[PDB]
Amino acid sequence: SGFRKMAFPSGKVEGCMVQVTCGTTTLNGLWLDDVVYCPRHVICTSEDMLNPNYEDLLIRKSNHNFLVQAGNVQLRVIGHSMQNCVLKLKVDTANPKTPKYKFVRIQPGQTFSVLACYNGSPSGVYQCAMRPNFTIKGSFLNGSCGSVGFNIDYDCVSFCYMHHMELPTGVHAGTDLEGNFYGPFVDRQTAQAAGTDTTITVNVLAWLYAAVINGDRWFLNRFTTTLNDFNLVAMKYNYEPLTQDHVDILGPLSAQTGIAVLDMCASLKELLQNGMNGRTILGSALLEDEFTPFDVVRQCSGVT
């Protein structure tokens, strides 16, 4: 028992982290096979970032201008190309530590592990969620760009995120491994304000199920609700609407605990309307929305 914000083991991703330097800017790159992926803003100065024309800036760069270093050995760059907001640097050596991998584009509400890196050296791993406004609340400093988000399915790493920028509000924006930003963000130092950060309702419900499984049941009430009634209260509290798909996704948790999904919704509804009254759920004084239903089943069954 016990429930923790758990990240995937990072070893498979550590073996892929390299340092990419272009001129005076050094950031992280992802080395899979003979390609190094990194944010295209590696070719910009702090000034260029105000209004960069990446195709024009790129014309002044040659293969030898991108310095790729894995550990302490230099990789030879034999080609370079821009795919949306990421650069793909073709090296002459395939990464001997390349795990089985996929590039995936996740949905808001989905969670992933982040391996925070600096100078191609991993320094920490934490679990994150793609927010409904397509931002992430990470812990990234200058030098962390190119740090990646991933999920592991037994031995295959699905890379879903690459860190690109910090918005004025302290939140983070990045792309999938094809260079496309999550949300409406652009890699330019301009007024980009994130939208409403709504709570991922289905994730909260899954975490309420994890609490029940782990012994915290004080919030279980004698009430029930409908999807429409619950959603009225959810909208008022800036919670994402719950769909029949979410109810279905919660099915295995509903089955394990014997608590119907709609009954758990009524419990959540009272927690919203009345607060925690100074109490904690799984050691938390707020409703946690960074565990998917899949994460709760995984942690509660020990999926390796």
Ligand X SMILES: Cc1ccc(NC(=O)Nc2cccnc2)s1
Residues with catalytic roles? 41, 145
- Report the C-alpha gap between 154 and 66 in whole angstroms: 34
CB of 148 to ligand X, least distance (A): 14
| Packing angle of the helix pair 201-213, 261-274 (nearest 10 deg) | 100
Total interface residues for a copy of itself by CB under 8 A: 54
CB of 41 to ligand X, least distance (A): 5
Tell me the window of 62-70, 86-94, 121-129, 201-209 that interacts with a copy of itself (CB under 8 A). Answer: 121-129
Q: Token pair 């099915």 is at which residue?
A: 251
Rule CB under 6 A: choose which of 5, 97, 105, 188 binds ligand X: 188
Q: Is 213 in the site for a copy of itself (CB under 8 A)?
A: no
**Which run of H or of E encompasses 166?**
strand 156-166
Residue 145 interaction partner, one of ligand X, a copy of itself, none, beta carbon < 5-8 Å per kind = ligand X
- Which is it for the CA torsion 50, 54, 60, 66, positive or negative? positive
- For helices 244-257 and 293-301, the axis angle rounded to 10 degrees is 20
Residue 70's binding partner among ligand X, a copy of itself, none (Cβ under 5 to 8 angstroms by kind) is none
Backbone angles phi, psi at 14, to 5 degrees: -60, -40
**Shortest spacing between CB 126 and a copy of itself, in angstroms:** 4
Q: How many residues make contact with ligand X (CB under 6 A)?
A: 12
Task: By CB under 8 A, tell whether 219 contacts a copy of itself.
Answer: no
Query: Judged by CB under 6 A, does residue 142 bind ligand X?
Result: yes
Residues from 139 through 168 that contact a copy of itself (CB under 8 A): 139-141, 143-144, 166
Distance CA 170, CA 167 (A): 6
The C-alpha angle with vertex 55 and arms to 51 and 56, in degrees rounded to 5, equals 70
Based on the shown chain and the rule CB under 8 A, indicate whether residue 299 belongs to the binding site for a copy of itself: yes
Q: What's the CA gap between 175 and 173, in Å, rounded? A: 7
Helix (H, G, I), strand (E, B) or coil at 164: strand
140 contacts ligand X (rule: CB under 6 A): yes
Determine the Cα–Cα distance for residues 294 and 161; give it in Å rounded to an integer.
19
Which of 113, 135, 144, 231 forms a contact with ligand X (CB under 6 A)? Answer: 144
Each residue 226-265 as x (binds a copy of itself by CB under 8 A) or -, in order, gives ----------------------------------------
Q: 185: Cβ–Cβ under 8 A, 6 or more apart, which residues?
A: 134, 135, 164, 165, 167, 173, 192
**Contacting residues toward ligand X, per CB under 6 A:** 41, 49, 140-142, 144-145, 165-166, 187-189
**Contacting residues toward a copy of itself, per CB under 8 A:** 1-12, 14-15, 115-119, 121-126, 128, 137-141, 143-144, 166, 170-172, 214-215, 275-276, 278, 280, 283-286, 298-304
